[PDB]
Amino acid sequence: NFMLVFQAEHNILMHPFHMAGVAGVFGGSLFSAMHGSLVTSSLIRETTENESTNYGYKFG
Amino acid sequence: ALTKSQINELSYLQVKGTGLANRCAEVVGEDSIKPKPGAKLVDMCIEPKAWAVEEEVGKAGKTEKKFVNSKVMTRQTYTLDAIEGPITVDGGKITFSEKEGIDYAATTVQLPGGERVPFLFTVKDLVAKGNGDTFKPGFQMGGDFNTPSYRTGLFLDPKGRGGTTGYDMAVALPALQLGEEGDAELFGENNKVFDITQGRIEMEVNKVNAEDSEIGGVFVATQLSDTDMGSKTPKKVLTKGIFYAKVEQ
Amino acid sequence: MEALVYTFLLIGTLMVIFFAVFFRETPRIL
Amino acid sequence: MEALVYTFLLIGTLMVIFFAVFFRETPRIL
Amino acid sequence: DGIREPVSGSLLYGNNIISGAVVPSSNAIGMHFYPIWEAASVDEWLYNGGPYQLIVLHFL
Amino acid sequence: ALRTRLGEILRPLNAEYGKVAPGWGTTPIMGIVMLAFLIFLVIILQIYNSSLIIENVDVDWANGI
Amino acid sequence: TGPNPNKQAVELNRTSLYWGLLLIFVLAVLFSSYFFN
Amino acid sequence: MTASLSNFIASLIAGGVVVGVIAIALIVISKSDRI
Amino acid sequence: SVSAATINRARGLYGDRIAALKDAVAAGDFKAIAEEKNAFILFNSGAYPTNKAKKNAAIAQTNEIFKAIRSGDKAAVKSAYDAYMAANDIRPLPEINANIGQGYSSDFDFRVRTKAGAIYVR
Amino acid sequence: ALPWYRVHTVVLNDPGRLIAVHLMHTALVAGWAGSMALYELAVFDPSDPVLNPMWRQGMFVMPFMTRLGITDSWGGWSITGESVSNPGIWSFEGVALSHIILSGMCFLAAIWHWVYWDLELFRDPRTGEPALDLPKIFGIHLFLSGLLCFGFGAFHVTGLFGPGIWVSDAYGITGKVQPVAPAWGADGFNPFNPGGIAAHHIAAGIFGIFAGIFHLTVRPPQRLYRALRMGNIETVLSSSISAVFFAAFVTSGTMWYGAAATPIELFGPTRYQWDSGYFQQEIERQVETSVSEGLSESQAWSRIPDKLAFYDYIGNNPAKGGLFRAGPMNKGDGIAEAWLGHPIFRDKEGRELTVRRMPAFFETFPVILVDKDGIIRADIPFRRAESKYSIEQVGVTVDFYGGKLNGQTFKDAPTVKKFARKAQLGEVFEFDRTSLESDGVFRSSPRGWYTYGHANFALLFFFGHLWHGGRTIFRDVFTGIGAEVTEQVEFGAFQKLGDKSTK
Amino acid sequence: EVQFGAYLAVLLGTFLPALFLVNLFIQTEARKAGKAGGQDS
Amino acid sequence: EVQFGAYLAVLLGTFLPALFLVNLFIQTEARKAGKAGGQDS
Ligand code: CLA
Ligand code: CLA
Ligand code: CLA
Ligand code: CLA
Ligand code: CLA
Ligand SMILES: CC1=C(/C=C/C(C)=C/C=C/C(C)=C/C=C/C=C(C)/C=C/C=C(C)/C=C/C2=C(C)CCCC2(C)C)C(C)(C)CCC1
Ligand SMILES: CC1=C(/C=C/C(C)=C/C=C/C(C)=C/C=C/C=C(C)/C=C/C=C(C)/C=C/C2=C(C)CCCC2(C)C)C(C)(C)CCC1
Ligand SMILES: [Fe+2]
Known part of the structure; x- marks a missing residue:
């Protein structure tokens, strides 16, 4: 209800200060998916086939 | 199902089990009889050879009423025998005026769809009217009889309620009453009314033997089903079969 | 009677979070 | 809709008996 | 809205988790700091949208 | 290792394992069949869309009877 | 017959319990009321 | 045979031309750009 | 999608564009029929888009118009053009008013500046 | 060791246990098909096939049973509106029972292979490894399936040996299971021709036979066997998923748009029959050919079949309901009883007004009464102060034609408004909302729910294709990358990409 | 008024x-x- | 007509x-x- 009423009187979709942060939420979760997929692709062999690959990183 | 002559040539023990005992006898020959004032019909065998119950049917696009050929759940307890009534002629046309005999057969006939339709196959208090005189190849009778209620008032609802007797209340739930309004939403069921309705039958005599003074033909009967003391709406049962009688003088 | 089911699940998540903070598997340096 | 619950439990016991006969822990002499 | 048409926010008065809410204060209050002790009763504090300002000013 | 009757009846079908034709095989023939299957799917996609229209063929409920 | 050279251990950490519970309870917060209507 | 069919074979051909123009152009350079 | 309002529209748009050629039947303006050939074609596509049997009826009712004007028998042209309006129910839009009206509400409608375009402004 | 998501990869290496597990899977699936069909027989009401068909009752499994020829049931009722004395083995109960037998027998067979993994048949001759020759196995299975497809088309749909297929008419009044001569021309690729379905499985089954015979003999080349990794069973899995969700976009597409394989009086009318007014044009044509016969109007409308009027109705759309409205359509608005009548709305000038019907988008559209050329003569106002077109001002009168309300004028201004709101949606019937305590608010068809689940399952299976399409190609680097990759990750010094034979 | 098997579908869809995940x-x-x-x- | 929380009390009283006994x-x-x-x- 807060978003719709604030669309009517205010027109937030045509506000570039709103366009900038939806480019910070799209691009935010863009780069989180990217940086997550570039690290987890390039992982060095420690585990076996029968064990989670997270156990190739000991803590510390 | 042969003639009454060689049914009588069989002892009781060798009929016993065959399923002969529902079978009406048959007539050979075409003749006239010309009943007298004082005669009657004595061995009125009436067997239905097919049942049919009114319903709502589905077909091409439209739903309406017709009769399904339906099957009997009672094994062999469905035919009437030894019905007699004084035959009379008043206006040239022959009347039957049923009085005695096995004049009801409590059957139940299951619909396609699972539904059971019990009814009484009765000839009770019949008055027929012939198309003419002198029993002939085509002498047709027809009249109106009485279907009484299937269960009489001594019969009791599975909780102990009846027409003549039983409880009047919902013995189940003894806190239903409690107000100005008691069990009144169950008054249509606590009330066990003995209804009586009216049927229809149409004889059509096909074969006549007057050496033994015996007629036989094919009837068409329509009547009304059971209403469980006025709870359910009864359906219209249509039966078709053959009949048989022996004429006095 | 579904407000029972609502408050059972909301307090249900609040219980699971309490065990997840204070009864966690600790990481060790070793 | 409780005839579901009735036949689920009756077939439920019939399943448990099937595993109890054919998948039992065998006793050994050793 | 301060139109004396109350809006049901809580679970105990027939709301879901999604349709339920804690409403904002009354329009008649406006900007006025409306604590518990400036109502005449907690009956009245909870009618006018008192517990919005209690949660919001302590969230922030 | 537990030979059965049926194990011996179907033993020839698991005989070859990794027996491989020495390079390039029938893959020109497979490509042409697969190219003809794709053209066949574009035709079905466009008749059904009615983005392609054939004489005496409509895309509409007909009375098979 | 015979023992397998296949069968292995199946594991789940303590955190993976807490993820797994909080997955089920929070989906039950979401999709509860839609089922109730 | 319709007018809608004559357009479609004209695009099957022209689709095979564009694939055919590119695929010949790849082979001719890759032989001249051997390795 | 073919819908009911798409049938209404091409009937409303081009039923003006067929019936208004009653002025051109009178003198027998032979170019004014040939300039409106696409009016006959596109009412035919819009008024019966799902109904192919009435559409193919209105194909030959359109062909009988142009076959007649190619010969030039002005009697047989009107003898066919009367049949075209009386089979398909060609009707122009008449004047609407305040009680009988509201042709358009959006300006996207196909009858905004037509003589059945009016609005009760209130 | 294994996490909860890798937990079935233990059965990859043992092919004797794969069959143990696929049998447990096919016992759960056919167990569901038998037990859900028994559940549906307890829910089903055969009393009205006209205004209470199977799709109206939320039957999901039953339309698939009847479209290939199961029309009769042991309770004596036929679905085609007949009465049968003996349906035989194959009825709704017998089919549902046969899947519970198959569920029990595949359950026992699943246990037998899980105990006996040591079948010799699963061993390589050359090495001792457990191994499945996937190109021979495919050629076996493709031969069987192509044989079974040919037998289905030639002997079941064409009805030489089998009973046929459900073939309805254009408007879903009459249909019956009947054999179908196959349509070999371009008419076969008309999806609404059931002759295409016979001609499909014959011709596609023929190629399934002769491609079986091809794969029974010809071995793969090195180039495919190395690239497509045919020694790996997960390459079968990924490529099979791609066939399985490809088939789901096709079935869920031809579900939602209709075909001869998914007819109207079986699954429900499509969405697109409400859009074009597909049944309106059939109502009005049958009225026009009745008044051209010379009939007056009130018996011109009474010759329209009730089932056809049932199809021109909004609560019979697949696109009308919602997600979390669960259950049959009859929990939406009630059991249909009888057609009321066709309203004709007249003004003071004796013109004709039709309430503009609602699109399938709007849960609510207002009441707007337009004439033959679509101009508003009347409405129902929201703001009732300065309204020019209110029904009490225009004086719209109601007169019905046909049904239980045949030939009854209504000049009563409230009831004109009441039947104006009813006539906005559908052909107006009278219902029974008290049987199951039906709400006042709509539902969706098996046509809505089938293509709901399958257009979603096809999406999830698109991801599972990319997962296993990824895991086969990168089977070696699935557990780490090594230190050998460090040299080949460089812009330059290899003029090809990663290849140590270069420079 | 509230739907019926949702008391079942939530609580058997939670527990x-x-x-199950407790036992792993x-x-x-x-x-x-x-x-x-x-x-x- | 059938009582209400019995669908809950049976199925949560079974499962x-x-x-629990599975996990021991x-x-x-x-x-x-x-x-x-x-x-x-
Ligand atoms: C006399 C021979 C004959 C005849 C009459 C037919 C008749 C038919 N075939 Mg065909 N077929 C034949 C021989 C024949 N076949 C042979 C010999 C083969 C080789 C084995 C095939 C293989 C074949 C396939 C593979 C398919 C058909 C299908 C069909 C049906 C078409 C249904 C329709 O209109 O489109 C409906 C079908 C389509 C529009 C297919 C388009 C393909 C997809 C949808 C393109 C999209 C790709 C992907 C799904 C995109 C996903 C994402 C996107 C949704 C966003 C029709 C019954 C189709 C079918 O079963 O439909 C029910 C089908 O999928 N045929
Ligand atoms: C003895 C075999 C047999 C038979 C004759 C039936 C018969 C029936 N089953 Mg069934 N079933 C069986 C075994 C059998 N079942 C087994 C073993 C299982 C467990 C897997 C099931 C699981 C099952 C379910 C889950 C359901 C049925 C249903 C049905 C009914 C409708 C069938 C239908 O619409 O199919 C439609 C089937 C298809 C459209 C599949 C087509 C095959 C695909 C598209 C082929 C594509 C791949 C292929 C390899 C292509 C390459 C070949 C090509 C080159 C030629 C029908 C009464 C349905 C029903 O109403 O329940 C009673 C239902 O829901 N069955
Ligand atoms: C492809 C799957 C499929 C489809 C389309 C249908 C279709 C249908 N079924 Mg059916 N059914 C299926 C599989 C399917 N069935 C299976 C596998 C079962 C066994 C469990 C059943 C058991 C079943 C019963 C017992 C009944 C139906 C009924 C129905 C009909 C009404 C639809 C309905 O109520 O939806 C309801 C839809 C929803 C509730 C939407 C759920 C949205 C998704 C799935 C959310 C899932 C995510 C979430 C995390 C779930 C976890 C819960 C959370 C608290 C943790 C409809 C024709 C009813 C009927 O009238 O038939 C006679 C009925 O009573 N079905
Ligand atoms: C024919 C389909 C099919 C098959 C045979 C497999 C088979 C496999 N997948 Mg897989 N997958 C598929 C489809 C399939 N997948 C799809 C569609 C997706 C996308 C969602 C995935 C995503 C996926 C991932 C991301 C991973 C696998 C993994 C695996 C392997 C182990 C699976 C396991 O232990 O699950 C364990 C699952 C459970 C113990 C329970 C999961 C609980 C689910 C969510 C609910 C249960 C479903 C419910 C009972 C009913 C299902 C209805 C049905 C219609 C879907 C195994 C080889 C794993 C692998 O390769 O190992 C590294 C892995 O990491 N798959
Ligand atoms: C985003 C889409 C996408 C992606 C990334 C992949 C990725 C992959 N697929 Mg694949 N696949 C997809 C969609 C996709 N698929 C779809 C929709 C289908 C069903 C048709 C398939 C069917 C499929 C099979 C059957 C197999 C793969 C395989 C593979 C893997 C090997 C690479 C390969 O050859 O790709 C496949 C190649 C492509 C996707 C190229 C598509 C380019 C086409 C030819 C364009 C044609 C234009 C079109 C016809 C224009 C007309 C249509 C118009 C009228 C609308 C790889 C993981 C293989 C695998 O798993 O290896 C182990 C394998 O066996 N795929
Ligand atoms: C043993 C045996 C037997 C028996 C059998 C049986 C009894 C069976 C049954 C079976 C069955 C009875 C089965 C069924 C099952 C079920 C299922 C399998 C289910 C499924 C489910 C799932 C899969 C899920 C679903 C869902 C949901 C819930 C939600 C939404 C989504 C979905 C849809 C996903 C016999 C005697 C014959 C023989 C001998 C042996
Ligand atoms: C023994 C064995 C085995 C195992 C097996 C398995 C593992 C199984 C599984 C199984 C499964 C895994 C199953 C599942 C099932 C499920 C279910 C069965 C579910 C369903 C559900 C339901 C039925 C519900 C319903 C409902 C209701 C009631 C209400 C609400 C709604 C709903 C729908 C939710 C193996 C192979 C190893 C080997 C051999 C032996
Ligand atoms: Fe990082």
Whole structure:
């Protein structure tokens, strides 16, 4: 209800200060998916086939 | 199902089990009889050879009423025998005026769809009217009889309620009453009314033997089903079969 | 009677979070 | 809709008996 | 809205988790700091949208 | 290792394992069949869309009877 | 017959319990009321 | 045979031309750009 | 999608564009029929888009118009053009008013500046 | 060791246990098909096939049973509106029972292979490894399936040996299971021709036979066997998923748009029959050919079949309901009883007004009464102060034609408004909302729910294709990358990409 | 007025997946306790 | 007409004691597998 009423009187979709942060939420979760997929692709062999690959990183 | 002559040539023990005992006898020959004032019909065998119950049917696009050929759940307890009534002629046309005999057969006939339709196959208090005189190849009778209620008032609802007797209340739930309004939403069921309705039958005599003074033909009967003391709406049962009688003088 | 089911699940998540903070598997340096 | 619950439990016991006969822990002499 | 048409926010008065809410204060209050002790009763504090300002000013 | 009757009846079908034709095989023939299957799917996609229209063929409920 | 050279251990950490519970309870917060209507 | 069919074979051909123009152009350079 | 309002529209748009050629039947303006050939074609596509049997009826009712004007028998042209309006129910839009009206509400409608375009402004 | 998501990869290496597990899977699936069909027989009401068909009752499994020829049931009722004395083995109960037998027998067979993994048949001759020759196995299975497809088309749909297929008419009044001569021309690729379905499985089954015979003999080349990794069973899995969700976009597409394989009086009318007014044009044509016969109007409308009027109705759309409205359509608005009548709305000038019907988008559209050329003569106002077109001002009168309300004028201004709101949606019937305590608010068809689940399952299976399409190609680097990759990750010094034979 | 089997579908849709994931945790804690031989077996 | 929370009381009175007793069995089978060191830990 807060978003719709604030669309009517205010027109937030045509506000570039709103366009900038939806480019910070799209691009935010863009780069989180990217940086997550570039690290987890390039992982060095420690585990076996029968064990989670997270156990190739000991803590510390 | 042969003639009454060689049914009588069989002892009781060798009929016993065959399923002969529902079978009406048959007539050979075409003749006239010309009943007298004082005669009657004595061995009125009436067997239905097919049942049919009114319903709502589905077909091409439209739903309406017709009769399904339906099957009997009672094994062999469905035919009437030894019905007699004084035959009379008043206006040239022959009347039957049923009085005695096995004049009801409590059957139940299951619909396609699972539904059971019990009814009484009765000839009770019949008055027929012939198309003419002198029993002939085509002498047709027809009249109106009485279907009484299937269960009489001594019969009791599975909780102990009846027409003549039983409880009047919902013995189940003894806190239903409690107000100005008691069990009144169950008054249509606590009330066990003995209804009586009216049927229809149409004889059509096909074969006549007057050496033994015996007629036989094919009837068409329509009547009304059971209403469980006025709870359910009864359906219209249509039966078709053959009949048989022996004429006095 | 579904407000029972609502408050059972909301307090249900609040219980699971309490065990997840204070009864966690600790990481060790070793 | 409780005839579901009735036949689920009756077939439920019939399943448990099937595993109890054919998948039992065998006793050994050793 | 301060139109004396109350809006049901809580679970105990027939709301879901999604349709339920804690409403904002009354329009008649406006900007006025409306604590518990400036109502005449907690009956009245909870009618006018008192517990919005209690949660919001302590969230922030 | 537990030979059965049926194990011996179907033993020839698991005989070859990794027996491989020495390079390039029938893959020109497979490509042409697969190219003809794709053209066949574009035709079905466009008749059904009615983005392609054939004489005496409509895309509409007909009375098979 | 015979023992397998296949069968292995199946594991789940303590955190993976807490993820797994909080997955089920929070989906039950979401999709509860839609089922109730 | 319709007018809608004559357009479609004209695009099957022209689709095979564009694939055919590119695929010949790849082979001719890759032989001249051997390795 | 073919819908009911798409049938209404091409009937409303081009039923003006067929019936208004009653002025051109009178003198027998032979170019004014040939300039409106696409009016006959596109009412035919819009008024019966799902109904192919009435559409193919209105194909030959359109062909009988142009076959007649190619010969030039002005009697047989009107003898066919009367049949075209009386089979398909060609009707122009008449004047609407305040009680009988509201042709358009959006300006996207196909009858905004037509003589059945009016609005009760209130 | 294994996490909860890798937990079935233990059965990859043992092919004797794969069959143990696929049998447990096919016992759960056919167990569901038998037990859900028994559940549906307890829910089903055969009393009205006209205004209470199977799709109206939320039957999901039953339309698939009847479209290939199961029309009769042991309770004596036929679905085609007949009465049968003996349906035989194959009825709704017998089919549902046969899947519970198959569920029990595949359950026992699943246990037998899980105990006996040591079948010799699963061993390589050359090495001792457990191994499945996937190109021979495919050629076996493709031969069987192509044989079974040919037998289905030639002997079941064409009805030489089998009973046929459900073939309805254009408007879903009459249909019956009947054999179908196959349509070999371009008419076969008309999806609404059931002759295409016979001609499909014959011709596609023929190629399934002769491609079986091809794969029974010809071995793969090195180039495919190395690239497509045919020694790996997960390459079968990924490529099979791609066939399985490809088939789901096709079935869920031809579900939602209709075909001869998914007819109207079986699954429900499509969405697109409400859009074009597909049944309106059939109502009005049958009225026009009745008044051209010379009939007056009130018996011109009474010759329209009730089932056809049932199809021109909004609560019979697949696109009308919602997600979390669960259950049959009859929990939406009630059991249909009888057609009321066709309203004709007249003004003071004796013109004709039709309430503009609602699109399938709007849960609510207002009441707007337009004439033959679509101009508003009347409405129902929201703001009732300065309204020019209110029904009490225009004086719209109601007169019905046909049904239980045949030939009854209504000049009563409230009831004109009441039947104006009813006539906005559908052909107006009278219902029974008290049987199951039906709400006042709509539902969706098996046509809505089938293509709901399958257009979603096809999406999830698109991801599972990319997962296993990824895991086969990168089977070696699935557990780490090594230190050998460090040299080949460089812009330059290899003029090809990663290849140590270069420079 | 509230729908009916939702009391079943929520609570069996919580507890049967919740109690399942407990037991993959109880399995390991016993398996790691059976591994390192202590007072428990 | 049938009583209401009995759909809950049966099915949560089956599954919650049934799934409990499963896990005292799953606990031992893991504990006896952790004891004798095999392929599982
Ligand atoms: C006399 C021979 C004959 C005849 C009459 C037919 C008749 C038919 N075939 Mg055909 N077929 C034949 C021989 C024949 N076949 C042979 C010999 C083969 C080789 C084995 C095939 C293989 C074949 C396939 C593979 C398919 C058909 C299908 C069909 C049906 C078409 C249904 C329709 O209109 O489109 C409906 C079908 C389509 C529009 C297919 C388009 C393909 C997809 C949808 C393109 C999209 C790709 C992907 C799904 C995109 C996903 C994402 C996107 C949704 C966003 C029709 C019954 C189709 C079918 O079963 O439909 C029910 C089908 O999928 N045929
Ligand atoms: C003895 C075999 C047999 C028979 C004759 C039937 C018969 C029936 N089953 Mg069934 N079933 C069986 C075994 C059998 N079942 C087994 C073993 C299982 C477990 C897997 C099931 C699981 C099952 C379910 C889950 C359901 C049925 C249903 C049905 C009914 C409708 C069938 C239908 O619409 O199919 C439609 C089937 C298809 C459209 C599949 C087509 C095959 C695909 C598209 C082929 C594509 C791949 C192929 C390899 C292509 C390459 C070949 C090509 C080159 C030629 C029908 C009464 C349905 C029903 O109403 O329940 C009673 C239902 O829901 N069955
Ligand atoms: C492809 C799957 C499929 C489809 C389309 C249908 C279709 C249908 N079924 Mg059916 N059914 C299926 C599989 C399917 N069935 C299976 C596998 C079962 C066994 C469990 C059943 C058991 C079943 C019963 C018992 C009944 C139906 C009924 C119906 C009909 C009404 C639809 C309805 O109520 O939806 C309801 C839809 C929803 C509730 C939407 C759920 C949205 C998704 C799935 C959310 C899932 C995510 C979330 C995390 C779930 C976890 C819960 C959370 C609290 C943790 C409809 C024709 C009813 C009927 O009248 O038939 C006679 C009925 O009573 N079905
Ligand atoms: C024919 C389909 C099919 C098959 C045979 C497999 C088979 C496999 N997948 Mg897989 N997958 C598939 C489809 C399939 N997948 C799809 C569609 C996706 C996308 C969602 C995935 C995503 C996926 C991932 C991301 C991973 C696998 C993994 C695996 C392997 C182990 C699976 C396991 O232990 O699950 C364990 C699952 C459970 C113990 C329970 C999961 C609980 C689910 C969410 C609910 C249960 C479903 C419910 C009972 C009913 C299902 C209805 C049905 C219609 C879907 C195994 C080879 C894993 C692998 O390769 O190992 C590294 C892995 O990491 N798959
Ligand atoms: C985003 C889409 C996408 C992606 C990334 C992949 C990725 C992959 N697929 Mg694949 N696949 C997809 C969609 C996709 N698929 C779809 C929709 C289908 C069903 C048709 C398939 C069917 C499929 C099979 C059957 C197999 C793969 C395989 C593979 C893997 C090997 C690479 C390969 O050859 O790709 C496949 C190649 C492509 C996707 C190229 C598509 C380019 C086409 C030819 C364009 C044609 C234009 C079109 C016809 C224009 C007319 C249509 C118009 C009228 C609308 C790889 C993981 C293989 C695998 O798993 O290896 C182990 C394998 O066996 N795929
Ligand atoms: C043993 C045996 C037997 C028996 C059998 C049986 C009894 C069976 C049954 C079976 C069955 C009875 C089965 C069924 C099952 C079920 C299922 C299998 C289910 C499924 C489910 C799932 C899969 C899920 C679903 C869902 C949901 C819930 C939600 C939404 C989504 C979905 C849809 C996903 C016999 C005697 C014959 C023989 C001998 C042996
Ligand atoms: C023994 C064995 C085995 C195993 C098996 C398995 C593992 C199984 C599984 C199984 C499964 C895994 C199953 C599942 C099932 C499920 C279910 C069965 C579910 C369903 C659900 C339901 C039925 C519900 C319903 C409902 C209701 C009631 C209400 C609300 C709604 C709903 C719908 C939710 C193996 C192979 C190893 C080997 C051999 C032996
Ligand atoms: Fe990082």
